[model samples]
Target: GSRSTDAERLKHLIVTPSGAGEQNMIGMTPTVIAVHYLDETEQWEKFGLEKRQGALELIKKGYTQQLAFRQPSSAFAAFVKRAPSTWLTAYVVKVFSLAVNLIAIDSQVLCGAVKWLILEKQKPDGVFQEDAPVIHQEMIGGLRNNNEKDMALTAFVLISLQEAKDICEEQVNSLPGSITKAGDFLEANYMNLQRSYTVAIAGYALAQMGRLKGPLLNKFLTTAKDKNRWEDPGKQLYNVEATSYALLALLQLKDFDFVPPVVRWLNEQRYYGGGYGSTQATFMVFQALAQYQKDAP
Candidate 1:
């Protein structure tokens, strides 16, 4: 079959498994190879091997590293179930799972799950808590000092909330001020391109706010492009997380023109095992790239 046909076929088969699904296991190796083949073929047709190789490499690495654990895990389920006082991690996990479920097109379950999180955890201030950690309240005042971690977490939460709204309109609303406040905080305190984490997260937040369109948007878009193309002194440099979020924010800006360049950079950073890494600097790249390819032409 042609690559497009195979791509469509695999998407259908994976999404709607046959009867005896649990018993009739599709061996992992063949599944990986098939998907890889389709993805590679798509790349060759769309932009040649050089362009498509990045995505193919990442997909293969994903299969190898099995960052699948990054998906909602039993630990996350247990944490949410126990209702840990710190709501931060719970919200993060919920948001992560929400992204996965959205991708899976499980709207009913996704809606119910997010609604539960919003109602159960929303603060009177409208934003969710930073953490359920016993010390969470005390920590909020000092969040500026922890900008990188806080901003990244806040961005993810807001992105998830925005996505939830798109999937289930009646059940959700715009993100709370607390989320917006964090965004404002980022704008005021951490606007430098040197702070890639802050820039990436802040960009996502700005994109969510419907503000990534004019000069400010162009500034970020340019910065992200420059950073991805940066050369290391003498090493095989890769910051998957930053590159991923940067691509995501750019995509959210509704500017498809940047897709080719961004995708090219991503393909160059692939790990040998086919899975991307989660360095404090670049953990989110694989997920971001996966999403990018899904929406790409």
Candidate 2:
């Protein structure tokens, strides 16, 4: 591992750097990336207007008042009625960010959902988490975890809220320096973890804060070298969730030199359906792969 893409890896990909330029292209689909690129300036700054307009046509024909998303469990009903479902809501927020950022939705129609997430879903400490330990012990029991929430969950919230910043005024301002607080919490609690969805997400979140730079960045990279996949569970033996975040973390570091094997490992988890897995894993995997393609040599 060791953060090296390794020459033997990605043999199917051309063994050379073909572009002298790079684009942010984060959260973008490959279609938009190509459709929006302007040969006049050689950059991807435009909003992919035509592409968005086309999408808008689709929306106009069949748009719903709310997104067709699922709650965390059948045990729960409404989005914020229960604690753990906010985790799913957070992922929905991430999905919303992609749409908002792409200019597909004007005014970000889901301001209320994001607002509800802020008021009901967030903890006073700025940690975005599932049910507290009390709920875990007394309510619906899960296989693992206890009240501290998960580093992955917290980082996911930070990243989601951070992404929605500037798109939604109220939700963005729900907590001042909230991302910073989450960043600090991550640094304090999950600093030593080597490779996991938590580390990858924390790295991505901190990278946004100018926190994952220089000396601060090496640890995650070092940890990413060997542990690309986490032993989460018997979810079909696939751990694209961890590898997805790991790939993003490495991409944030601009570690193009070492991402091939990780990317290779990531694709191995792909289902015949063309996506990796259910919602969370699918989003992260799509995002991670987009990042890799954006920065690939």
Candidate 3:
């Protein structure tokens, strides 16, 4: 399928060298693109051996580049000489956690980041807070207030921590309860969530934790069906980001019937570079499409 070429285009976009903070994206996105195909040899063959090896080489470079940002606590900030960012650290954990299967991701790095998250970033209630300024506020836009922001951030952090726990169980202590608490937090706030972007990521988090209910799934799917694609109201990049998370939740539930329309819309949004505007949108849309390719018949 031309999606393979689309992946190639997106890969080129991701691996392009960038400035300091944005380099974090370069560190993580290759792993995001590569992990989906690592186990599926036939799919990789279809994707082409040259492209697969290229992804592997980028993952290696990303790994080394990402490690250079690690603090004493193993947490990461977009730029050096800044305090460690809770969000960036979790994002790194999420990607490196997944990259373990694809490359020799250092287990110690995962341990340090997870330890810092549990001890510092996470509150008593299991919700995570952003300790640093969010560089890409557009990625977390549409929240009505700080309360909703925390909920969305918690969902994202939960996804990262959950992946870390799965990959490195022993180093991450009390992970089960922490995940449960985070899930409970999301559950409590589920009905009150108003924005589609927040709801999408929150639902994806809950779905990952097996806490997403039928009503929650229907809430997201109903909106997608009504609009034929999810939107972040005013922001185009957020639109792609919101739809990607929603699409991922649908794929997780094996709800394949609702996928094509959203996929079609996403394809239409691609730039000449094969990206959907922002790095967050591009990586997420690529991940969702790759998942659909692998998981759907």
Candidate 4:
């Protein structure tokens, strides 16, 4: 079947609010971003005009509800019920930045949150650390130690910063400097990142900077299973997330050969309801698939 059929299942899960609780709530922002990502598909018309409009309206309302979680420090926590999380804030910034063209998002909220991300989470050495434990700790993964944790977080945040810089340059002046330092940190430490998930995200970041080389790609490739999907070395549960990031990283490096097989694995992983097991995996799968359809079509 066409990927549009795959998207139809995914859209059924995201086009409406799942619930107001943390898991579904935290996933909502990315769901909004996923809606836009899928909007780029050549078969978007297959998604139906009414469903597309409904998703847009749902996302607009989601934006307002999400804003309520913004803390005084401009960082966000799960439902604003605890200490602010740098990782979650970056995710929010990335989503909001992408949503700018689709909906009315407050730029100051994005700017303030990004400023907090740089000031509080980004170290002088350019690594992004979580100020508090992320509610979805699995989203961050179980890195062996804080150093690998920092590496993974930095790569994830750098991708967000890349998206934010192009849109919020006037409000956040330190973006370019922040991006450069973070990129350098990833470049220097890419060889030591042991997890395939970390390598995938770092590879994607470095590939954007024109700094990724064959060594990192080869290292990441070694982790692939059956020439298609990737699974976390220590935790098999993150297979969906790992595969999504790997697909993204490979595409950034222009490795088009594996797109079909990689996507085939991901397509088979989706539940009948159109989502992967976790919120992070579901949106990320949509992202990688949407990006593949966009670039390869």
Report the CA-based lDDT of candidate 4 relative to the real structure: 0.71
Residue 296 shift from truth in candidate 4, angstroms = 1.3
Tens-digit lDDT track for model 3 on 108-187?
88878888888888888888988686565543334323547888889888878877886668767777778898899998
Query: Where does candidate 2 stray beyond 4 Å?
Result: 1-84, 101-108, 131-148, 169-171, 192-195, 213-216, 225-238, 270-277
Evaluation by TM-score, superior candidate among 2 and 3: 3
In what order do the candidates fall by TM-score, top score first?
Answer: 4, 3, 2, 1
What ranking of all candidate models by lDDT puts the best one first? 4, 3, 2, 1
Q: At residue 181, give the lDDT of candidate 1.
A: 53
Q: Compared to the true structure, candidate 4 yields what TM-score?
A: 0.85
**Per-residue alpha-carbon lDDT of candidate 4 for residues 1-297, written as tens digits (9 for 90 to 100):** 235434555555554554332454455655575576667764456656666677788887777777777888898887666888777788778667778878887878888888888878888999988757765655443232354777778888998888787677998888888999999899888888776677777777777777787786677777677888776545454667678778887788788886778888887865322333355665566677767877774
- Model 3 has how many clashing residue pairs? 0
Record all residue pairs in model 3 with backbone atoms less than 3 Å apart, i.e. clashing.
none
For model 1, what is the C-alpha lDDT against the true structure?
Answer: 0.43
Taking the tens digit of each residue's C-alpha lDDT, what string does model 1 give over 164-239? 5666675445335344654565455445445554466567667767765566566676666454542222223233
Candidate 3, residue 101: Cα displacement in angstroms equals 3.1
Instruction: Give lDDT tens digits, candidate 2, residues 40-105.
Output: 122223333354455434333222222322233311223324343554445445655665534455
TM-score for predicted model 1 compared with the true structure: 0.53
Clashes of each: 15, 2, 0, 0
- lDDT, residue 188, candidate 3: 82
